[PDB]
């Protein structure tokens, strides 16, 4: 954590914003922590926890995941790359969950939020697994304003990492649901230039990205399975002071590398 404190401070000076990282080695329990308790906008990264919340309630409602959902043109928000293709047919809850995780589909996300009782419902789920930091307040795309100092629709890298470990590796989800959750994340298509880019080919990895765009705000959280040791869980979030500041996928990848090197690769 101190082996990387000055490399991190330099990386974020080159970026021109702020970088929050929390990484945990599930074996030794070693952690690496940089701005890990600061709040960062979640952007689309709430969609992973959305799917986990849906999986949780499929433990009470049999057939939830295969329930068909029908929706109108008015449900199609900018960047709905999957749900726009099934507008005239509809989609199952599992297909919408997969779309939200693997393509960061915004209409799918908002449809799933409705089923859960909106942002308060998802926040309620996160409280039930012991996360007191997470808050979702708004819908796509309003949630992505990324205003400096605004606590709405934020969490911390450490809370994100801790909740992810509970849902992917711990006991927050029953074992069928937990494996489904992990599979959706492993099939994510939007994270090739972020945490995955810090990861060698022979490692298994599931992630979920977030890209507010404004205020140089983007993120990525991931469970990483090295060959021959325990999985690593980590979260990398960024933000920047000016609305037109650009986010950097390379900066996220670079913080992921520093976190893995900090834990002992
Ligand atoms: C446009 C907005 O919904 C954005 C967000 O709020 O985060 C969506 C769209 C997308 S852009 C995905 C582009 N990926 C390219 N490889 C992100 C993301 O990065 O996860 N989520």
């Amino acid at each position: 954590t101190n082996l990387v404190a000055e490399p991190f401070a330099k990386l974020e000076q080159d970026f021109g914003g702020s970088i929050g990282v929390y990484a945990m080695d599930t074996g030794s329990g070693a952690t690496v922590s940089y701005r890990a308790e600061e709040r960062f906008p979640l952007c689309s990264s709430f969609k992973g926890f959305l799917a986990a919340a849906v999986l949780a309630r499929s433990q009470q409602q049999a057939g939830l995941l295969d329930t068909p959902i029908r929706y109108g043109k008015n449900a199609l928000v900018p960047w709905s790359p999957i749900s726009e293709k099934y507008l005239t047919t509809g989609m199952t809850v599992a297909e919408l969950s997969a779309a939200a995780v693997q393509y960061s589909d915004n209409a799918a996300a908002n449809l799933l939020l409705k089923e859960l009782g909106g942002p308060a419902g998802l926040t309620a789920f996160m409280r039930s697994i012991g996360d007191t930091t997470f808050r979702l307040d708004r819908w796509e795309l309003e949630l992505a304003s990324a205003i400096p100092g605004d606590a709405r629709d934020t969490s911390s890298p450490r809370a994100v990492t801790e909740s992810l470990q509970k849902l992917t590796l711990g006991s927050a989800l029953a074992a069928p649901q937990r494996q489904q959750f992990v599979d959706w994340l492993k099939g994510n298509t939007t994270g090739n230039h972020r945490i995955r880019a810090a990861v060698p080919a022979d490692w298994a990895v599931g992630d979920k990205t977030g890209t507010c765009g404004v205020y140089g705000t983007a993120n990525d959280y991931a469970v990483v399975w090295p060959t021959g040791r325990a999985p690593i869980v980590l979260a990398v979030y960024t933000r920047a002071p000016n609305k037109d500041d650009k986010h950097s996928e390379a900066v996220i990848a670079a913080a992921a590398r520093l976190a893995l090197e900090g834990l002992g690769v």
Side-chain angles (χ1 to χ4, degrees), residues 42-47 77-79 101 103-106 140-141 143-144 188-194 208-213 217-219 247 249:
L42 286 155
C43 311
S44 290
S45 73
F46 84 93
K47 288 168 186 154
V77 158
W79 190 257
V101 169
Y103 294 88
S104 186
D105 194 289
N106 285 322
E140 288 288 11
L141 297 164
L143 63 87
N188 178 33
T189 81
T190 72
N192 290 339
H193 308 284
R194 294 177 193 194
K208 177 68 192 88
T209 63
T211 312
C212 290
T217 299
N219 54 67
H247 74 280
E249 299 204 278

PDB file of all heavy atoms in Angstrom, residues 42-47 77-79 101 103-106 140-141 143-144 188-194 208-213 217-219 247 249, ligand 1:
ATOM      1  N   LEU A  42     -20.438   6.400  -9.713  1.00  0.00           N
ATOM      2  CA  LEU A  42     -20.500   5.013 -10.167  1.00  0.00           C
ATOM      3  C   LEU A  42     -20.587   4.914 -11.678  1.00  0.00           C
ATOM      4  O   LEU A  42     -20.096   3.939 -12.258  1.00  0.00           O
ATOM      5  CB  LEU A  42     -21.696   4.285  -9.569  1.00  0.00           C
ATOM      6  CG  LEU A  42     -21.686   3.871  -8.099  1.00  0.00           C
ATOM      7  CD1 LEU A  42     -23.146   3.767  -7.610  1.00  0.00           C
ATOM      8  CD2 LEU A  42     -20.948   2.582  -7.889  1.00  0.00           C
ATOM      9  N   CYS A  43     -21.220   5.878 -12.328  1.00  0.00           N
ATOM     10  CA  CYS A  43     -21.483   5.746 -13.764  1.00  0.00           C
ATOM     11  C   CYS A  43     -22.175   4.392 -13.978  1.00  0.00           C
ATOM     12  O   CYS A  43     -22.806   3.852 -13.063  1.00  0.00           O
ATOM     13  CB  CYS A  43     -20.188   5.936 -14.547  1.00  0.00           C
ATOM     14  SG  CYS A  43     -19.236   7.395 -14.076  1.00  0.00           S
ATOM     15  N   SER A  44     -21.994   3.777 -15.150  1.00  0.00           N
ATOM     16  CA  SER A  44     -22.654   2.507 -15.447  1.00  0.00           C
ATOM     17  C   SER A  44     -22.218   1.369 -14.540  1.00  0.00           C
ATOM     18  O   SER A  44     -22.772   0.270 -14.659  1.00  0.00           O
ATOM     19  CB  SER A  44     -22.383   2.093 -16.886  1.00  0.00           C
ATOM     20  OG  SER A  44     -23.054   2.926 -17.802  1.00  0.00           O
ATOM     21  N   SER A  45     -21.226   1.572 -13.666  1.00  0.00           N
ATOM     22  CA  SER A  45     -20.737   0.414 -12.929  1.00  0.00           C
ATOM     23  C   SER A  45     -21.770  -0.109 -11.934  1.00  0.00           C
ATOM     24  O   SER A  45     -21.662  -1.261 -11.497  1.00  0.00           O
ATOM     25  CB  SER A  45     -19.381   0.729 -12.263  1.00  0.00           C
ATOM     26  OG  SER A  45     -19.484   1.596 -11.132  1.00  0.00           O
ATOM     27  N   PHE A  46     -22.814   0.664 -11.636  1.00  0.00           N
ATOM     28  CA  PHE A  46     -23.907   0.135 -10.827  1.00  0.00           C
ATOM     29  C   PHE A  46     -24.600  -1.040 -11.512  1.00  0.00           C
ATOM     30  O   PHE A  46     -25.227  -1.854 -10.834  1.00  0.00           O
ATOM     31  CB  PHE A  46     -24.931   1.235 -10.514  1.00  0.00           C
ATOM     32  CG  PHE A  46     -25.950   1.450 -11.611  1.00  0.00           C
ATOM     33  CD1 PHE A  46     -27.177   0.775 -11.587  1.00  0.00           C
ATOM     34  CD2 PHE A  46     -25.680   2.309 -12.671  1.00  0.00           C
ATOM     35  CE1 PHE A  46     -28.093   0.965 -12.565  1.00  0.00           C
ATOM     36  CE2 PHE A  46     -26.615   2.495 -13.687  1.00  0.00           C
ATOM     37  CZ  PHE A  46     -27.815   1.833 -13.627  1.00  0.00           C
ATOM     38  N   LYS A  47     -24.485  -1.165 -12.831  1.00  0.00           N
ATOM     39  CA  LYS A  47     -25.231  -2.215 -13.524  1.00  0.00           C
ATOM     40  C   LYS A  47     -24.802  -3.620 -13.087  1.00  0.00           C
ATOM     41  O   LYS A  47     -25.632  -4.533 -13.041  1.00  0.00           O
ATOM     42  CB  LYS A  47     -25.097  -2.026 -15.036  1.00  0.00           C
ATOM     43  CG  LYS A  47     -25.905  -0.823 -15.540  1.00  0.00           C
ATOM     44  CD  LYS A  47     -25.561  -0.442 -16.980  1.00  0.00           C
ATOM     45  CE  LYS A  47     -26.269   0.857 -17.411  1.00  0.00           C
ATOM     46  NZ  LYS A  47     -25.583   1.630 -18.489  1.00  0.00           N
ATOM     47  N   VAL A  77     -33.269   4.618 -24.396  1.00  0.00           N
ATOM     48  CA  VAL A  77     -32.369   5.706 -24.018  1.00  0.00           C
ATOM     49  C   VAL A  77     -31.111   5.625 -24.884  1.00  0.00           C
ATOM     50  O   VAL A  77     -30.816   4.546 -25.419  1.00  0.00           O
ATOM     51  CB  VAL A  77     -32.089   5.600 -22.506  1.00  0.00           C
ATOM     52  CG1 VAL A  77     -30.817   6.299 -22.068  1.00  0.00           C
ATOM     53  CG2 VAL A  77     -33.283   6.130 -21.743  1.00  0.00           C
ATOM     54  N   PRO A  78     -30.372   6.721 -25.100  1.00  0.00           N
ATOM     55  CA  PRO A  78     -29.099   6.614 -25.820  1.00  0.00           C
ATOM     56  C   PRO A  78     -28.211   5.513 -25.249  1.00  0.00           C
ATOM     57  O   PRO A  78     -28.164   5.287 -24.033  1.00  0.00           O
ATOM     58  CB  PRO A  78     -28.474   8.000 -25.640  1.00  0.00           C
ATOM     59  CG  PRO A  78     -29.619   8.909 -25.464  1.00  0.00           C
ATOM     60  CD  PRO A  78     -30.718   8.129 -24.816  1.00  0.00           C
ATOM     61  N   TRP A  79     -27.517   4.820 -26.157  1.00  0.00           N
ATOM     62  CA  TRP A  79     -26.732   3.616 -25.875  1.00  0.00           C
ATOM     63  C   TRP A  79     -27.596   2.519 -25.250  1.00  0.00           C
ATOM     64  O   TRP A  79     -27.516   2.208 -24.055  1.00  0.00           O
ATOM     65  CB  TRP A  79     -25.525   3.895 -24.975  1.00  0.00           C
ATOM     66  CG  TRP A  79     -24.633   2.689 -24.920  1.00  0.00           C
ATOM     67  CD1 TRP A  79     -24.526   1.781 -23.897  1.00  0.00           C
ATOM     68  CD2 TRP A  79     -23.745   2.241 -25.944  1.00  0.00           C
ATOM     69  NE1 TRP A  79     -23.610   0.805 -24.220  1.00  0.00           N
ATOM     70  CE2 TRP A  79     -23.117   1.064 -25.473  1.00  0.00           C
ATOM     71  CE3 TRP A  79     -23.413   2.720 -27.217  1.00  0.00           C
ATOM     72  CZ2 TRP A  79     -22.178   0.362 -26.232  1.00  0.00           C
ATOM     73  CZ3 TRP A  79     -22.479   2.023 -27.966  1.00  0.00           C
ATOM     74  CH2 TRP A  79     -21.871   0.858 -27.469  1.00  0.00           C
ATOM     75  N   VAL A 101     -24.935  -5.793 -18.072  1.00  0.00           N
ATOM     76  CA  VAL A 101     -23.579  -6.072 -17.603  1.00  0.00           C
ATOM     77  C   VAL A 101     -22.586  -6.077 -18.760  1.00  0.00           C
ATOM     78  O   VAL A 101     -21.526  -5.441 -18.692  1.00  0.00           O
ATOM     79  CB  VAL A 101     -23.553  -7.406 -16.835  1.00  0.00           C
ATOM     80  CG1 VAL A 101     -22.114  -7.836 -16.572  1.00  0.00           C
ATOM     81  CG2 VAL A 101     -24.356  -7.271 -15.510  1.00  0.00           C
ATOM     82  N   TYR A 103     -22.921  -5.192 -22.160  1.00  0.00           N
ATOM     83  CA  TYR A 103     -22.893  -4.083 -23.112  1.00  0.00           C
ATOM     84  C   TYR A 103     -23.203  -2.745 -22.453  1.00  0.00           C
ATOM     85  O   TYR A 103     -23.234  -1.714 -23.141  1.00  0.00           O
ATOM     86  CB  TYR A 103     -23.877  -4.347 -24.270  1.00  0.00           C
ATOM     87  CG  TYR A 103     -23.435  -5.533 -25.092  1.00  0.00           C
ATOM     88  CD1 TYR A 103     -23.823  -6.825 -24.745  1.00  0.00           C
ATOM     89  CD2 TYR A 103     -22.572  -5.369 -26.169  1.00  0.00           C
ATOM     90  CE1 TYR A 103     -23.389  -7.930 -25.469  1.00  0.00           C
ATOM     91  CE2 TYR A 103     -22.128  -6.475 -26.910  1.00  0.00           C
ATOM     92  CZ  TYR A 103     -22.548  -7.751 -26.549  1.00  0.00           C
ATOM     93  OH  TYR A 103     -22.129  -8.856 -27.264  1.00  0.00           O
ATOM     94  N   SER A 104     -23.426  -2.742 -21.144  1.00  0.00           N
ATOM     95  CA  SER A 104     -23.782  -1.543 -20.400  1.00  0.00           C
ATOM     96  C   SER A 104     -25.001  -0.881 -21.055  1.00  0.00           C
ATOM     97  O   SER A 104     -25.050   0.331 -21.282  1.00  0.00           O
ATOM     98  CB  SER A 104     -22.567  -0.612 -20.288  1.00  0.00           C
ATOM     99  OG  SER A 104     -22.839   0.492 -19.450  1.00  0.00           O
ATOM    100  N   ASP A 105     -25.979  -1.721 -21.404  1.00  0.00           N
ATOM    101  CA  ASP A 105     -27.214  -1.297 -22.068  1.00  0.00           C
ATOM    102  C   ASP A 105     -28.065  -0.434 -21.127  1.00  0.00           C
ATOM    103  O   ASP A 105     -28.465  -0.892 -20.051  1.00  0.00           O
ATOM    104  CB  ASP A 105     -27.987  -2.540 -22.505  1.00  0.00           C
ATOM    105  CG  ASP A 105     -29.104  -2.235 -23.506  1.00  0.00           C
ATOM    106  OD1 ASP A 105     -30.113  -1.634 -23.091  1.00  0.00           O
ATOM    107  OD2 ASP A 105     -28.981  -2.635 -24.697  1.00  0.00           O
ATOM    108  N   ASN A 106     -28.373   0.804 -21.533  1.00  0.00           N
ATOM    109  CA  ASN A 106     -29.041   1.725 -20.604  1.00  0.00           C
ATOM    110  C   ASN A 106     -30.536   1.455 -20.481  1.00  0.00           C
ATOM    111  O   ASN A 106     -31.098   1.545 -19.381  1.00  0.00           O
ATOM    112  CB  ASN A 106     -28.815   3.172 -21.032  1.00  0.00           C
ATOM    113  CG  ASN A 106     -27.425   3.648 -20.716  1.00  0.00           C
ATOM    114  OD1 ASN A 106     -26.862   3.310 -19.667  1.00  0.00           O
ATOM    115  ND2 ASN A 106     -26.850   4.425 -21.624  1.00  0.00           N
ATOM    116  N   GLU A 140     -30.574   6.129 -15.541  1.00  0.00           N
ATOM    117  CA  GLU A 140     -29.827   6.469 -16.753  1.00  0.00           C
ATOM    118  C   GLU A 140     -30.684   7.392 -17.609  1.00  0.00           C
ATOM    119  O   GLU A 140     -31.880   7.141 -17.787  1.00  0.00           O
ATOM    120  CB  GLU A 140     -29.473   5.210 -17.553  1.00  0.00           C
ATOM    121  CG  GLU A 140     -28.391   4.302 -16.952  1.00  0.00           C
ATOM    122  CD  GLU A 140     -26.970   4.894 -17.027  1.00  0.00           C
ATOM    123  OE1 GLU A 140     -26.803   6.090 -17.349  1.00  0.00           O
ATOM    124  OE2 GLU A 140     -26.006   4.153 -16.748  1.00  0.00           O
ATOM    125  N   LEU A 141     -30.100   8.457 -18.158  1.00  0.00           N
ATOM    126  CA  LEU A 141     -28.692   8.813 -18.113  1.00  0.00           C
ATOM    127  C   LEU A 141     -28.407   9.916 -17.090  1.00  0.00           C
ATOM    128  O   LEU A 141     -27.279  10.401 -17.003  1.00  0.00           O
ATOM    129  CB  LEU A 141     -28.265   9.315 -19.494  1.00  0.00           C
ATOM    130  CG  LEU A 141     -28.296   8.421 -20.742  1.00  0.00           C
ATOM    131  CD1 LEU A 141     -28.201   9.293 -21.985  1.00  0.00           C
ATOM    132  CD2 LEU A 141     -27.142   7.467 -20.736  1.00  0.00           C
ATOM    133  N   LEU A 143     -28.067   9.835 -13.994  1.00  0.00           N
ATOM    134  CA  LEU A 143     -27.165   9.479 -12.912  1.00  0.00           C
ATOM    135  C   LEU A 143     -25.711   9.809 -13.228  1.00  0.00           C
ATOM    136  O   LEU A 143     -24.889   9.796 -12.314  1.00  0.00           O
ATOM    137  CB  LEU A 143     -27.303   7.990 -12.579  1.00  0.00           C
ATOM    138  CG  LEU A 143     -26.939   6.949 -13.644  1.00  0.00           C
ATOM    139  CD1 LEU A 143     -25.434   6.573 -13.638  1.00  0.00           C
ATOM    140  CD2 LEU A 143     -27.797   5.715 -13.456  1.00  0.00           C
ATOM    141  N   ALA A 144     -25.378  10.083 -14.489  1.00  0.00           N
ATOM    142  CA  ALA A 144     -23.996  10.156 -14.942  1.00  0.00           C
ATOM    143  C   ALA A 144     -23.463  11.590 -15.006  1.00  0.00           C
ATOM    144  O   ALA A 144     -22.434  11.830 -15.651  1.00  0.00           O
ATOM    145  CB  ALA A 144     -23.864   9.474 -16.307  1.00  0.00           C
ATOM    146  N   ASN A 188     -18.264  -9.747 -20.171  1.00  0.00           N
ATOM    147  CA  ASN A 188     -18.336  -8.315 -20.437  1.00  0.00           C
ATOM    148  C   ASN A 188     -17.535  -7.969 -21.685  1.00  0.00           C
ATOM    149  O   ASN A 188     -16.423  -8.467 -21.882  1.00  0.00           O
ATOM    150  CB  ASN A 188     -17.795  -7.501 -19.254  1.00  0.00           C
ATOM    151  CG  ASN A 188     -17.819  -6.013 -19.545  1.00  0.00           C
ATOM    152  OD1 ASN A 188     -18.708  -5.554 -20.249  1.00  0.00           O
ATOM    153  ND2 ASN A 188     -16.835  -5.268 -19.061  1.00  0.00           N
ATOM    154  N   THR A 189     -18.095  -7.095 -22.529  1.00  0.00           N
ATOM    155  CA  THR A 189     -17.433  -6.734 -23.781  1.00  0.00           C
ATOM    156  C   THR A 189     -16.829  -5.339 -23.786  1.00  0.00           C
ATOM    157  O   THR A 189     -16.158  -4.978 -24.759  1.00  0.00           O
ATOM    158  CB  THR A 189     -18.410  -6.863 -24.968  1.00  0.00           C
ATOM    159  OG1 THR A 189     -19.246  -5.702 -25.051  1.00  0.00           O
ATOM    160  CG2 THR A 189     -19.272  -8.110 -24.827  1.00  0.00           C
ATOM    161  N   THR A 190     -17.030  -4.547 -22.741  1.00  0.00           N
ATOM    162  CA  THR A 190     -16.638  -3.143 -22.753  1.00  0.00           C
ATOM    163  C   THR A 190     -15.332  -2.869 -22.022  1.00  0.00           C
ATOM    164  O   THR A 190     -14.869  -1.723 -22.024  1.00  0.00           O
ATOM    165  CB  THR A 190     -17.735  -2.284 -22.128  1.00  0.00           C
ATOM    166  OG1 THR A 190     -17.746  -2.523 -20.720  1.00  0.00           O
ATOM    167  CG2 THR A 190     -19.112  -2.630 -22.718  1.00  0.00           C
ATOM    168  N   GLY A 191     -14.716  -3.878 -21.420  1.00  0.00           N
ATOM    169  CA  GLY A 191     -13.569  -3.619 -20.570  1.00  0.00           C
ATOM    170  C   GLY A 191     -12.202  -4.023 -21.089  1.00  0.00           C
ATOM    171  O   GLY A 191     -11.279  -4.208 -20.290  1.00  0.00           O
ATOM    172  N   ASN A 192     -12.046  -4.142 -22.413  1.00  0.00           N
ATOM    173  CA  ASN A 192     -10.811  -4.674 -22.985  1.00  0.00           C
ATOM    174  C   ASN A 192      -9.611  -3.755 -22.777  1.00  0.00           C
ATOM    175  O   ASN A 192      -8.470  -4.237 -22.776  1.00  0.00           O
ATOM    176  CB  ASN A 192     -11.010  -4.940 -24.479  1.00  0.00           C
ATOM    177  CG  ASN A 192     -11.945  -6.104 -24.738  1.00  0.00           C
ATOM    178  OD1 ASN A 192     -12.144  -6.949 -23.866  1.00  0.00           O
ATOM    179  ND2 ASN A 192     -12.548  -6.138 -25.925  1.00  0.00           N
ATOM    180  N   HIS A 193      -9.836  -2.451 -22.597  1.00  0.00           N
ATOM    181  CA  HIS A 193      -8.753  -1.479 -22.498  1.00  0.00           C
ATOM    182  C   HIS A 193      -8.547  -0.973 -21.082  1.00  0.00           C
ATOM    183  O   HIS A 193      -7.857   0.030 -20.879  1.00  0.00           O
ATOM    184  CB  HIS A 193      -9.017  -0.318 -23.452  1.00  0.00           C
ATOM    185  CG  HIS A 193      -9.300  -0.774 -24.849  1.00  0.00           C
ATOM    186  ND1 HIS A 193      -8.307  -1.210 -25.698  1.00  0.00           N
ATOM    187  CD2 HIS A 193     -10.466  -0.924 -25.524  1.00  0.00           C
ATOM    188  CE1 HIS A 193      -8.844  -1.584 -26.846  1.00  0.00           C
ATOM    189  NE2 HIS A 193     -10.153  -1.418 -26.769  1.00  0.00           N
ATOM    190  N   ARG A 194      -9.125  -1.649 -20.094  1.00  0.00           N
ATOM    191  CA  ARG A 194      -9.060  -1.181 -18.716  1.00  0.00           C
ATOM    192  C   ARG A 194      -8.402  -2.287 -17.925  1.00  0.00           C
ATOM    193  O   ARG A 194      -7.258  -2.631 -18.214  1.00  0.00           O
ATOM    194  CB  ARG A 194     -10.431  -0.750 -18.226  1.00  0.00           C
ATOM    195  CG  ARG A 194     -10.898   0.469 -18.978  1.00  0.00           C
ATOM    196  CD  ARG A 194     -12.289   0.921 -18.592  1.00  0.00           C
ATOM    197  NE  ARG A 194     -12.755   1.884 -19.578  1.00  0.00           N
ATOM    198  CZ  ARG A 194     -13.809   2.679 -19.424  1.00  0.00           C
ATOM    199  NH1 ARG A 194     -14.525   2.646 -18.300  1.00  0.00           N
ATOM    200  NH2 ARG A 194     -14.127   3.526 -20.399  1.00  0.00           N
ATOM    201  N   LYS A 208     -16.872  -5.028 -14.821  1.00  0.00           N
ATOM    202  CA  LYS A 208     -17.913  -4.114 -15.264  1.00  0.00           C
ATOM    203  C   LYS A 208     -17.338  -2.705 -15.268  1.00  0.00           C
ATOM    204  O   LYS A 208     -16.747  -2.267 -14.272  1.00  0.00           O
ATOM    205  CB  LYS A 208     -19.149  -4.187 -14.370  1.00  0.00           C
ATOM    206  CG  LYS A 208     -20.238  -3.193 -14.770  1.00  0.00           C
ATOM    207  CD  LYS A 208     -20.832  -3.599 -16.117  1.00  0.00           C
ATOM    208  CE  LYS A 208     -21.699  -2.489 -16.685  1.00  0.00           C
ATOM    209  NZ  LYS A 208     -20.944  -1.513 -17.506  1.00  0.00           N
ATOM    210  N   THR A 209     -17.513  -2.007 -16.386  1.00  0.00           N
ATOM    211  CA  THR A 209     -16.967  -0.678 -16.587  1.00  0.00           C
ATOM    212  C   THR A 209     -18.023   0.392 -16.291  1.00  0.00           C
ATOM    213  O   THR A 209     -19.214   0.119 -16.130  1.00  0.00           O
ATOM    214  CB  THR A 209     -16.445  -0.525 -18.026  1.00  0.00           C
ATOM    215  OG1 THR A 209     -17.533  -0.665 -18.939  1.00  0.00           O
ATOM    216  CG2 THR A 209     -15.422  -1.590 -18.355  1.00  0.00           C
ATOM    217  N   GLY A 210     -17.553   1.629 -16.206  1.00  0.00           N
ATOM    218  CA  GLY A 210     -18.406   2.794 -16.100  1.00  0.00           C
ATOM    219  C   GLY A 210     -17.719   3.940 -16.808  1.00  0.00           C
ATOM    220  O   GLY A 210     -16.493   4.066 -16.734  1.00  0.00           O
ATOM    221  N   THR A 211     -18.483   4.756 -17.532  1.00  0.00           N
ATOM    222  CA  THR A 211     -17.895   5.859 -18.291  1.00  0.00           C
ATOM    223  C   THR A 211     -18.921   6.996 -18.281  1.00  0.00           C
ATOM    224  O   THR A 211     -19.786   7.073 -19.155  1.00  0.00           O
ATOM    225  CB  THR A 211     -17.546   5.447 -19.717  1.00  0.00           C
ATOM    226  OG1 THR A 211     -16.827   4.204 -19.707  1.00  0.00           O
ATOM    227  CG2 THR A 211     -16.656   6.516 -20.368  1.00  0.00           C
ATOM    228  N   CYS A 212     -18.830   7.860 -17.271  1.00  0.00           N
ATOM    229  CA  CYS A 212     -19.626   9.078 -17.325  1.00  0.00           C
ATOM    230  C   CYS A 212     -19.157   9.982 -18.459  1.00  0.00           C
ATOM    231  O   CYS A 212     -19.967  10.669 -19.079  1.00  0.00           O
ATOM    232  CB  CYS A 212     -19.564   9.814 -15.983  1.00  0.00           C
ATOM    233  SG  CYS A 212     -20.438   8.975 -14.613  1.00  0.00           S
ATOM    234  N   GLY A 213     -17.860   9.989 -18.751  1.00  0.00           N
ATOM    235  CA  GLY A 213     -17.344  10.833 -19.811  1.00  0.00           C
ATOM    236  C   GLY A 213     -17.012  12.230 -19.327  1.00  0.00           C
ATOM    237  O   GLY A 213     -15.853  12.657 -19.397  1.00  0.00           O
ATOM    238  N   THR A 217     -14.415  11.193 -15.819  1.00  0.00           N
ATOM    239  CA  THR A 217     -14.892  10.169 -14.898  1.00  0.00           C
ATOM    240  C   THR A 217     -15.141   8.856 -15.634  1.00  0.00           C
ATOM    241  O   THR A 217     -16.001   8.781 -16.521  1.00  0.00           O
ATOM    242  CB  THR A 217     -16.170  10.633 -14.209  1.00  0.00           C
ATOM    243  OG1 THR A 217     -15.887  11.816 -13.451  1.00  0.00           O
ATOM    244  CG2 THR A 217     -16.703   9.529 -13.297  1.00  0.00           C
ATOM    245  N   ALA A 218     -14.392   7.825 -15.258  1.00  0.00           N
ATOM    246  CA  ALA A 218     -14.602   6.483 -15.783  1.00  0.00           C
ATOM    247  C   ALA A 218     -14.128   5.518 -14.717  1.00  0.00           C
ATOM    248  O   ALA A 218     -13.505   5.920 -13.726  1.00  0.00           O
ATOM    249  CB  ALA A 218     -13.873   6.257 -17.110  1.00  0.00           C
ATOM    250  N   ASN A 219     -14.459   4.248 -14.893  1.00  0.00           N
ATOM    251  CA  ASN A 219     -14.092   3.285 -13.867  1.00  0.00           C
ATOM    252  C   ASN A 219     -14.160   1.876 -14.430  1.00  0.00           C
ATOM    253  O   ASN A 219     -14.560   1.651 -15.579  1.00  0.00           O
ATOM    254  CB  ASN A 219     -14.995   3.422 -12.646  1.00  0.00           C
ATOM    255  CG  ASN A 219     -16.458   3.328 -13.005  1.00  0.00           C
ATOM    256  OD1 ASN A 219     -16.938   2.271 -13.416  1.00  0.00           O
ATOM    257  ND2 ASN A 219     -17.181   4.440 -12.853  1.00  0.00           N
ATOM    258  N   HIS A 247     -11.603  11.336 -19.754  1.00  0.00           N
ATOM    259  CA  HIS A 247     -11.204  10.132 -19.051  1.00  0.00           C
ATOM    260  C   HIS A 247     -10.148   9.401 -19.871  1.00  0.00           C
ATOM    261  O   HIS A 247      -9.945   9.681 -21.055  1.00  0.00           O
ATOM    262  CB  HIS A 247     -12.412   9.235 -18.801  1.00  0.00           C
ATOM    263  CG  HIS A 247     -12.898   8.529 -20.030  1.00  0.00           C
ATOM    264  ND1 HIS A 247     -13.685   9.143 -20.984  1.00  0.00           N
ATOM    265  CD2 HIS A 247     -12.691   7.265 -20.470  1.00  0.00           C
ATOM    266  CE1 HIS A 247     -13.947   8.283 -21.952  1.00  0.00           C
ATOM    267  NE2 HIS A 247     -13.354   7.137 -21.665  1.00  0.00           N
ATOM    268  N   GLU A 249      -8.733   5.400 -20.551  1.00  0.00           N
ATOM    269  CA  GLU A 249      -8.703   3.963 -20.323  1.00  0.00           C
ATOM    270  C   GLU A 249      -7.298   3.509 -19.942  1.00  0.00           C
ATOM    271  O   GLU A 249      -7.129   2.645 -19.073  1.00  0.00           O
ATOM    272  CB  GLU A 249      -9.216   3.233 -21.563  1.00  0.00           C
ATOM    273  CG  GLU A 249     -10.646   3.611 -21.898  1.00  0.00           C
ATOM    274  CD  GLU A 249     -11.368   2.563 -22.691  1.00  0.00           C
ATOM    275  OE1 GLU A 249     -11.180   2.526 -23.928  1.00  0.00           O
ATOM    276  OE2 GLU A 249     -12.136   1.786 -22.079  1.00  0.00           O
TER     277      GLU A 249
HETATM  278  C1  LIG B   1     -23.536   6.764 -22.097  1.00  0.00           C
HETATM  279  C2  LIG B   1     -23.563   6.255 -20.665  1.00  0.00           C
HETATM  280  O1  LIG B   1     -24.685   5.462 -20.458  1.00  0.00           O
HETATM  281  C3  LIG B   1     -22.297   5.409 -20.306  1.00  0.00           C
HETATM  282  C4  LIG B   1     -22.177   5.468 -18.741  1.00  0.00           C
HETATM  283  O2  LIG B   1     -23.049   6.102 -18.082  1.00  0.00           O
HETATM  284  O3  LIG B   1     -21.243   4.876 -18.133  1.00  0.00           O
HETATM  285  C5  LIG B   1     -22.494   3.929 -20.724  1.00  0.00           C
HETATM  286  C6  LIG B   1     -22.052   3.650 -22.168  1.00  0.00           C
HETATM  287  C7  LIG B   1     -20.807   3.122 -22.020  1.00  0.00           C
HETATM  288  S1  LIG B   1     -19.510   3.424 -23.249  1.00  0.00           S
HETATM  289  C8  LIG B   1     -18.854   1.765 -23.613  1.00  0.00           C
HETATM  290  C9  LIG B   1     -17.778   1.859 -24.694  1.00  0.00           C
HETATM  291  N1  LIG B   1     -16.801   0.775 -24.654  1.00  0.00           N
HETATM  292  C10 LIG B   1     -15.895   0.636 -25.644  1.00  0.00           C
HETATM  293  N2  LIG B   1     -15.048  -0.293 -25.625  1.00  0.00           N
HETATM  294  C11 LIG B   1     -20.438   3.033 -20.576  1.00  0.00           C
HETATM  295  C12 LIG B   1     -19.312   2.096 -20.157  1.00  0.00           C
HETATM  296  O4  LIG B   1     -18.128   2.372 -20.478  1.00  0.00           O
HETATM  297  O5  LIG B   1     -19.550   1.047 -19.505  1.00  0.00           O
HETATM  298  N3  LIG B   1     -21.608   3.069 -19.923  1.00  0.00           N
END
